[PDB]
Write a sequence for this structure.
């Protein structure tokens, strides 16, 4: 039995960039349904009692799709915050400049990958096995946890993440995403 | 060059089941963007001298995704009509009863397949090479035209198809889809 983790801020704290209505549906209905579907699928199985990351790394099918979406959305909500956004400093800024040349080049490449990601999915900044940073996109519930790369930051590009506020304009959603990035959470993941 | 086909009815003719606002974004912006993107991707290539269907059967990646979404949305708008829906008649009802037992059983099975189709995609009623009907789901821009089966009916379950009117309630959208089905189009597709 897994519980929907509390949001680390109020429902309206990302407004106007992501509306209170979008959190009401995206957290309150979509992320909640993935926890309920996961609890129903693993009841009575060898997956009950394993951690969420263990389930994601050992399953496939509906158990995988729901477990990875529960984890992926909790990671996403922790990637956003009120009174954040802007350019990183410190260790994060040094690693981003070393791998992409500059913060501006990273932002441009991450925005391009997130807009080109066809269909539903997620676009990720990851730390590779060799210590270098990379941008990778996944489809549907796919996550870097099934690989050797460590996830540092993500953006949800499933249409429910932005359709209430931006309709078809996924570029506008990505421009507002940058005003919300919680670089303290990215710093915690870089040093993990 | 390919052109966005005219919609078969006024943009408010499917209301209250699909609003005029969903038609202006889904037809006016999403279907139009796939035509524009296809045209720009094939400019100057050998794909420029082929029918849309031949492009769908011989391409991959971006050319395929846009060409198949152009075809899939034109097919979808023709499957819907004002003053239609209800139970089919004639050869269609006969064929549905032969392969599924009855219309109520077909309707249940198609609804279920459409609700369980994970992420973005399409659910189809097809006539297989052997003559039996079957329900098939595809992901993202996937279409039965790359196989031996003949498409007869489809429902778009990309979230942009229903999010303005139904938000997360894809079952509500499918209940209202049954009120719009153009059984005349389905019969012309079966008779070939
Ligand atoms: Fe989401
Ligand atoms: Fe669509």
């Amino acid at each position: 039995s897994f519980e929907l983790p509390a949001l680390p801020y109020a429902k309206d704290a990302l407004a106007p960039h992501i509306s209170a209505e979008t959190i009401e549906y995206h957290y309150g209905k979509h992320h909640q349904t993935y926890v309920t579907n996961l609890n129903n699928l693993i009841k009575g199985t060898a997956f009950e009692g394993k951690s969420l990351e263990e389930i994601i790394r050992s399953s496939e099918g509906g158990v995988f799709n729901n477990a990875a979406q529960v984890w992926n959305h909790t990671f996403y909500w922790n990637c956003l915050a009120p009174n954040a956004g802007g350019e990183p400093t410190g260790k994060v800024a040094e690693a981003i400049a070393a791998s992409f040349g500059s913060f501006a080049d990273f932002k441009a490449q991450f925005t391009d990958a997130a807009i080109k990601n066809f269909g539903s999915g997620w676009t990720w900044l990851v730390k590779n096995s060799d210590g270098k940073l990379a941008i990778v996109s996944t489809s549907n519930a796919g996550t870097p946890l099934t690989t050797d790369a460590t996830p540092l930051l993500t953006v949800d590009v499933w249409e429910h993440a932005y359709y209430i506020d931006y309709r078809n304009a996924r570029p506008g959603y990505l421009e507002h995403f940058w005003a919300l990035v919680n670089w303290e959470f990215v710093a915690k993941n870089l040093a993990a």
The pocket of fe (iii) ion (ligand 2) is lined by residues B 26, 30, 73, 156, 158, 160-161 (CB under 6 Å). The longest helix of chain B spans residues 20-42. Chain B is about 50% helix and 10% strand.
